[PDB]
Amino acid sequence: MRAELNQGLIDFLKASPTPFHATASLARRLEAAGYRRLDERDAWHTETGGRYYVTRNDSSLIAIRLGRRSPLESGFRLVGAHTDSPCLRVKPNPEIARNGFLQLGVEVYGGALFAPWFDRDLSLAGRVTFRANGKLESRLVDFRKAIAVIPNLAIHLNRAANEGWPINAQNELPPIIAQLAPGEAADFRLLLDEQLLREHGITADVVLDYELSFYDTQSAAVVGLNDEFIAGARLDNLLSCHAGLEALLNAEGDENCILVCTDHEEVPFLEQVLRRLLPEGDAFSRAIQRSLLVSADNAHGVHPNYADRHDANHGPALNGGPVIKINSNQRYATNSETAGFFRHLCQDSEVPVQSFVTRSDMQVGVRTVDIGLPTFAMHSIRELAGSHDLAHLVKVLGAFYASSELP
Amino acid sequence: MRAELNQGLIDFLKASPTPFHATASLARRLEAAGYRRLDERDAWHTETGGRYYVTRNDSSLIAIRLGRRSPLESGFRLVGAHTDSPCLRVKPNPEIARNGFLQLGVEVYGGALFAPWFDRDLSLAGRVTFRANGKLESRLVDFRKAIAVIPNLAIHLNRAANEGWPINAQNELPPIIAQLAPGEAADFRLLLDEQLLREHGITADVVLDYELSFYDTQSAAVVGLNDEFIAGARLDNLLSCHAGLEALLNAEGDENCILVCTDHEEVPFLEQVLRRLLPEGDAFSRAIQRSLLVSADNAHGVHPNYADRHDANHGPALNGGPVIKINSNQRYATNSETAGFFRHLCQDSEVPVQSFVTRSDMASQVGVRTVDIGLPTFAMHSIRELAGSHDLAHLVKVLGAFYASSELP
Amino acid sequence: MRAELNQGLIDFLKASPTPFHATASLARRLEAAGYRRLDERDAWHTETGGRYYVTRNDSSLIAIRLGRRSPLESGFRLVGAHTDSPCLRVKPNPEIARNGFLQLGVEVYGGALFAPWFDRDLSLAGRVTFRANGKLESRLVDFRKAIAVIPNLAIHLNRAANEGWPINAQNELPPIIAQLAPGEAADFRLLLDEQLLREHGITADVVLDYELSFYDTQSAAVVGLNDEFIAGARLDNLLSCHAGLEALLNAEGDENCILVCTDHEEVPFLEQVLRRLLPEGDAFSRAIQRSLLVSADNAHGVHPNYADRHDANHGPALNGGPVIKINSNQRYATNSETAGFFRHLCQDSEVPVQSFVTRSDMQVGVRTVDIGLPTFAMHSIRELAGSHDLAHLVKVLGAFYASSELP
Ligand SMILES: [Co+2]
Ligand SMILES: [Co+2]
Ligand SMILES: [Co+2]
Ligand SMILES: [Co+2]
Ligand SMILES: [Co+2]
Ligand SMILES: [Co+2]
């Protein structure tokens, strides 16, 4: 499955600098495959089998592939991922004007590593809400061009730099985007208004608020002497989003399938959607108890320069295939029946499979196995995974999507 | 008018991932412009009006533009830059095999900022020395392709990462280039040999040693909402090398002109070369006292997230022109005469000029008077530094006015 | 307006020293306004145009305005606030007898500031559960009188008192209520029986258990040279409770409206009440997705003596109007659409509006905007707010309640 798959990933990451864009990319692909969009606000006709997707807040998406069999007999085959990643968001009154520069004050979304955000050609994307012709409207904008940089302080002026210092997100992370007069006027909402005309043709009476993420304009790429790796932003968790979608779109059979890609993992929807798919009563409970959730989120590869952060018996290899993640304290829902099932699936697909627990010194109600492709450096602005692993994961999710029996 | 310089700089940086490659790029352009190479091993016949360059270790270059009058009478105009930048160099027995990976051990060259080298698509380039059927060869290689990465450790396994930790070069900086295990012979010198075949159609008997730097494969680029900035590796100090060379090739007037770009600044050539110009005896000392060296190396612009690392009266602006660097404890050789001269020179060429002095709580065995100047930058010694998209034009104009200058102090 | 609104607030705080008392004060206001209590054990018949309220544990209240067009088309407009505040609670067996004094052991409720509770004329109020003719009753009591003091230790005996010491809640916070003889014997439940007789004309067989809060007997008050401020206990969050009830009672139009004042916010109901207001499980998601929750809870005004605790670009000003609270990491669920709407709603209702974000180094599935009035000294026994802001908040909350169209 190539190469083609790895190229599909790179394009998908490119089109998705935010959870909003991620969602839009998933939906345009779902639509090209003939899934019809449902609006939660409207009444649903619903025809049995039955290809649908629904969004919430333009940043969460559920894909529903209804099969021949009653979900009360066959249960659901659910794959879960998330559409968000740690990053830096623009503040509501962002303009900072000092030493000739115009900067934008940012907050740190999620458990982001600060250091890798320095010295990158960053751009800006996300959702803008504005008033046009009286009505409230929302669009996505993506500046595409590299408009921003968080420069490092020179080592000459910070000689114990490599000894480590607590990077202060308030002081040290606002990006520079331009130079000002001064005195010159600076209106970031005016800049967004320009970007609305430019990107959308819309003229806008005033710009109200926004959810804008800086991101790396350097694309994901295949790296390594023998091309054994993929480097890029947002692998956690768009690698899983892409994988599950590719598995859903190419799945054999007529099983009841769901793809759930939710927002804010990194900080109800599925339940309300499912309760609408089912004639209420014991139907919900009977379908869900026959179901299985494969929760796909990146795993930690044992890192060669940091090998002792891992249990020696449980250090996943990049390109060694999907990792089954166990944690007895319910950090992962995986148990012997869901783990045993997934393990059996990989064997029948001839896909290699690994295990991970952490070092011991470190709500729908569905059965769940937690898996993930091994990865280095989450959540940096540029994470690392293996170039063989996407084909592995797509193979077994596709096998799972086509599985008649579940535990 | 300004954008071709910047385009040329981006091209120059791309072709120069190492000091060896920068010297090669500089030399290629000089030859295209009519400068001819002198070998230091050989006798020189230098006629006036002549255009020469000189090379040492394939990583230092001196470019000579001999003028109408003897340098004994009218002096030298000298611009200095350097061809090296902090980076990671491959060790001589580099193969590290563990957890299924192949890695290359690296030493840190210069005062590199470690953290920015993480999570970068790295490639490998430099000089390779080998024995071929059966003589001693040196060639330059550039894998071009992204072959290596130094991944960060996940924050889940280093939760107090943003509080800082002392990054250990021996431990945390060896890059991953491939996967091994279940076997398997890993021999780096053999990989170099395939790279010799692939790049030069050359095969080798045995590869002996090599000087190879890892570099960022992401090109330099113009950035900012109004394109005010240039980002890239090696702005320290290929920015000045470019600037100096553009200015040398296009400067008007006669006048004796010198471009000196030396290696190992980040850690005798010039003096020996200048002496082989001019007659024996007192000719040298007399020429040098009528001479002036503009040492061009990047300055620090005042950083708006770190503004108090600067003196509030001496905070250079990106795109505010060349900076005169003063340190009366001779960290810079600038004195009031050479600073005065350069200031006069900028004012005549309509080029804006700034001053820098360090916060007070923080050549030349030739004996040439010197002014130290630089274009203001951020993130000096990072894998990716920042500079003004306007400053290069500013610098080339004033160096051009310097090379054309009739009089010196 | 304003002076009358502020007097109403003051009276409300006085009437409400506990969650139980806040709920009772809300309940008797609504009933005066014609709202009829719905018992959760009963079956409900709700007509259009209905005005209802329902309580739980006598300390949470949900008031409901049913309009004419169905929640399936128009959704609900919901205002959220909470009934509780940080304070000190009497323990089950509280009598401490030492040094001639009677004291009551107290546990610290919520994230209270300890120092301000010292040297205050405290009283005691809350719920008493007792047995009367073997029947088992609960009544509210309010001693009203200043019956307790937690005195500071004199600076002469604690000379570095101004250097700060860790205040130990178990040791330094039990208040003094009386003096005791040599061996005089004290029974707190006996004093509670006398208060039952005193306040309700009731004798108890035996007093069983209780939930009693100490509170300051100093009334809320307008303060400042130009009367720009209001000072009082429990401004977090009875300020919002009061503002929401005014807004609900005076709201024009006939749209579907909810006021949610819950208990225990400072350490299920809403969903269960909403589900009983509309048929299927398809109707729930449809109506909730068309709804909007303005979650109203005090924000932090930038304090002139601690101004560096705020972001310089996001320092809300007392009497500056409601504050839209923002946090990408969902400490506040505000997004660009619900912020846009609220900002619009303020600007075309002529109320000034402010944004808040923290310094970067510091459910039922409904869209939400977190907003609050700017406040000083939050979780102290005596908090500070603007004497102009309550009028602002009531104005825009009413504007909200009369909004036909929601994001
Ligand atoms: Co994840
Ligand atoms: Co993550
Ligand atoms: Co330098
Ligand atoms: Co340097
Ligand atoms: Co509160
Ligand atoms: Co509170």
Tab-separated table of C-alpha atoms in Angstrom, chain C residues 125-286:
chain	number	residue	atom	x	y	z
C	125	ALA	CA	-26.994	29.552	59.343
C	126	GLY	CA	-27.941	26.444	57.328
C	127	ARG	CA	-29.877	23.195	57.352
C	128	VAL	CA	-30.785	21.258	60.526
C	129	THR	CA	-32.140	17.711	60.277
C	130	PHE	CA	-33.997	16.583	63.373
C	131	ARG	CA	-36.543	14.100	64.737
C	132	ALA	CA	-39.888	15.480	65.875
C	133	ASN	CA	-42.545	13.001	67.055
C	134	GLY	CA	-40.343	10.419	65.342
C	135	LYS	CA	-41.009	11.964	61.935
C	136	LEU	CA	-37.601	13.268	60.683
C	137	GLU	CA	-37.554	16.898	59.530
C	138	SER	CA	-35.286	19.415	57.897
C	139	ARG	CA	-35.477	23.096	58.649
C	140	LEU	CA	-33.376	26.130	57.873
C	141	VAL	CA	-32.028	28.145	60.810
C	142	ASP	CA	-30.362	31.545	60.983
C	143	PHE	CA	-28.990	32.760	64.296
C	144	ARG	CA	-28.800	36.292	62.765
C	145	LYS	CA	-26.959	37.609	65.876
C	146	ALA	CA	-23.155	37.802	65.850
C	147	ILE	CA	-22.446	34.637	67.827
C	148	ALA	CA	-18.856	33.769	66.849
C	149	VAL	CA	-15.400	35.248	66.408
C	150	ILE	CA	-12.190	33.713	65.066
C	151	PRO	CA	-9.769	36.120	66.674
C	152	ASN	CA	-6.270	36.688	65.324
C	153	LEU	CA	-3.327	36.040	67.580
C	154	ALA	CA	-1.909	39.411	68.670
C	155	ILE	CA	1.190	40.668	66.844
C	156	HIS	CA	2.977	40.971	70.226
C	157	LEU	CA	2.827	37.164	70.481
C	158	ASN	CA	3.480	36.634	66.802
C	159	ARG	CA	5.978	39.353	65.892
C	160	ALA	CA	6.704	38.071	62.378
C	161	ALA	CA	2.948	37.790	61.665
C	162	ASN	CA	3.328	40.169	58.726
C	163	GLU	CA	5.995	37.900	57.185
C	164	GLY	CA	3.297	35.286	56.701
C	165	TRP	CA	2.855	31.893	58.290
C	166	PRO	CA	0.995	28.878	56.978
C	167	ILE	CA	-2.452	29.145	58.579
C	168	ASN	CA	-3.532	25.739	59.831
C	169	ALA	CA	-7.285	25.319	59.328
C	170	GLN	CA	-7.564	22.531	61.924
C	171	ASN	CA	-5.868	24.652	64.609
C	172	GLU	CA	-6.503	28.343	64.060
C	173	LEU	CA	-9.956	28.423	62.465
C	174	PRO	CA	-12.441	26.998	65.005
C	175	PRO	CA	-14.485	30.059	66.003
C	176	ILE	CA	-15.313	31.028	69.607
C	177	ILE	CA	-19.012	31.202	70.482
C	178	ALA	CA	-19.133	31.283	74.310
C	179	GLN	CA	-17.491	30.962	77.703
C	180	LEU	CA	-17.965	27.857	79.817
C	181	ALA	CA	-17.858	27.294	83.590
C	182	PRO	CA	-15.362	24.968	85.387
C	183	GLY	CA	-17.262	21.861	84.281
C	184	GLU	CA	-20.352	23.308	82.594
C	185	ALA	CA	-20.929	20.781	79.748
C	186	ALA	CA	-21.920	21.895	76.271
C	187	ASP	CA	-24.208	20.272	73.693
C	188	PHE	CA	-24.277	22.024	70.332
C	189	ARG	CA	-27.410	20.089	69.320
C	190	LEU	CA	-29.062	21.512	72.435
C	191	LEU	CA	-28.316	25.041	71.322
C	192	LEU	CA	-29.730	24.048	67.930
C	193	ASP	CA	-32.915	22.849	69.642
C	194	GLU	CA	-33.275	26.269	71.281
C	195	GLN	CA	-32.793	27.973	67.901
C	196	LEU	CA	-35.513	25.713	66.479
C	197	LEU	CA	-37.805	26.872	69.257
C	198	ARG	CA	-36.603	30.467	68.878
C	199	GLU	CA	-36.933	30.670	65.085
C	200	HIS	CA	-39.705	28.149	64.267
C	201	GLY	CA	-41.531	27.609	67.574
C	202	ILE	CA	-40.481	23.959	67.317
C	203	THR	CA	-39.327	21.414	69.888
C	204	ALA	CA	-37.223	18.507	68.690
C	205	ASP	CA	-37.039	14.996	70.083
C	206	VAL	CA	-33.420	14.912	69.109
C	207	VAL	CA	-31.373	16.985	66.670
C	208	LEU	CA	-29.593	14.585	64.305
C	209	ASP	CA	-27.372	16.251	61.680
C	210	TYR	CA	-26.806	19.621	60.044
C	211	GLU	CA	-25.075	21.662	57.353
C	212	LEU	CA	-24.241	25.007	58.934
C	213	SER	CA	-22.084	27.801	57.422
C	214	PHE	CA	-20.509	30.625	59.364
C	215	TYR	CA	-20.961	33.972	57.630
C	216	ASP	CA	-20.177	37.625	58.205
C	217	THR	CA	-22.989	39.698	59.812
C	218	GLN	CA	-21.785	42.853	58.080
C	219	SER	CA	-24.175	43.605	55.257
C	220	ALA	CA	-23.135	44.155	51.719
C	221	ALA	CA	-22.714	47.890	51.076
C	222	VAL	CA	-21.978	50.477	48.405
C	223	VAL	CA	-18.496	51.924	49.025
C	224	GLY	CA	-15.997	54.379	47.558
C	225	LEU	CA	-15.664	58.150	47.365
C	226	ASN	CA	-18.108	58.265	44.461
C	227	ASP	CA	-19.934	55.057	45.407
C	228	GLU	CA	-18.275	53.109	42.591
C	229	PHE	CA	-18.061	49.801	44.448
C	230	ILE	CA	-20.031	47.120	46.284
C	231	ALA	CA	-18.458	45.067	49.086
C	232	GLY	CA	-19.861	41.848	50.504
C	233	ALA	CA	-19.601	38.124	51.191
C	234	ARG	CA	-20.782	35.614	48.579
C	235	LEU	CA	-20.545	37.946	45.560
C	236	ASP	CA	-19.065	34.831	44.029
C	237	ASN	CA	-21.598	33.819	42.906
C	238	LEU	CA	-24.811	35.265	44.347
C	239	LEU	CA	-24.079	38.354	42.259
C	240	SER	CA	-24.752	36.235	39.145
C	241	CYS	CA	-27.704	34.390	40.757
C	242	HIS	CA	-29.354	37.705	41.512
C	243	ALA	CA	-28.557	39.153	38.068
C	244	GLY	CA	-29.955	36.058	36.376
C	245	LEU	CA	-33.212	36.120	38.298
C	246	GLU	CA	-33.769	39.815	37.532
C	247	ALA	CA	-33.042	39.094	33.899
C	248	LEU	CA	-35.431	36.084	33.918
C	249	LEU	CA	-38.274	37.863	35.720
C	250	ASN	CA	-38.136	40.947	33.548
C	251	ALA	CA	-37.265	39.276	30.285
C	252	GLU	CA	-39.295	40.387	27.336
C	253	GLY	CA	-40.410	38.213	24.465
C	254	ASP	CA	-41.606	34.657	25.009
C	255	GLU	CA	-38.625	32.488	24.283
C	256	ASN	CA	-37.555	29.275	25.984
C	257	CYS	CA	-35.486	30.275	29.025
C	258	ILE	CA	-33.628	28.495	31.776
C	259	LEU	CA	-31.960	29.825	34.892
C	260	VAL	CA	-29.615	27.221	36.450
C	261	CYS	CA	-28.331	27.941	39.954
C	262	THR	CA	-26.529	24.844	41.179
C	263	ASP	CA	-24.882	23.943	44.457
C	264	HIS	CA	-21.372	22.489	44.924
C	265	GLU	CA	-19.763	24.365	42.046
C	266	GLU	CA	-17.046	25.426	44.444
C	267	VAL	CA	-15.725	21.865	45.092
C	268	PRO	CA	-26.853	15.541	36.390
C	269	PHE	CA	-29.661	17.836	37.593
C	270	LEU	CA	-29.860	20.035	34.498
C	271	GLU	CA	-29.925	17.175	32.019
C	272	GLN	CA	-32.598	15.254	33.896
C	273	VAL	CA	-34.807	18.347	34.005
C	274	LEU	CA	-34.215	19.227	30.341
C	275	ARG	CA	-34.996	15.673	29.169
C	276	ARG	CA	-38.397	15.781	30.886
C	277	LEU	CA	-39.272	18.967	28.971
C	278	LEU	CA	-39.177	17.331	25.529
C	279	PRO	CA	-40.046	13.863	24.117
C	280	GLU	CA	-37.548	11.502	22.449
C	281	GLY	CA	-33.741	11.227	22.502
C	282	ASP	CA	-33.774	12.752	19.037
C	283	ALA	CA	-35.561	15.804	20.421
C	284	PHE	CA	-32.998	16.320	23.157
C	285	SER	CA	-29.966	16.595	20.862
C	286	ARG	CA	-31.908	18.726	18.380
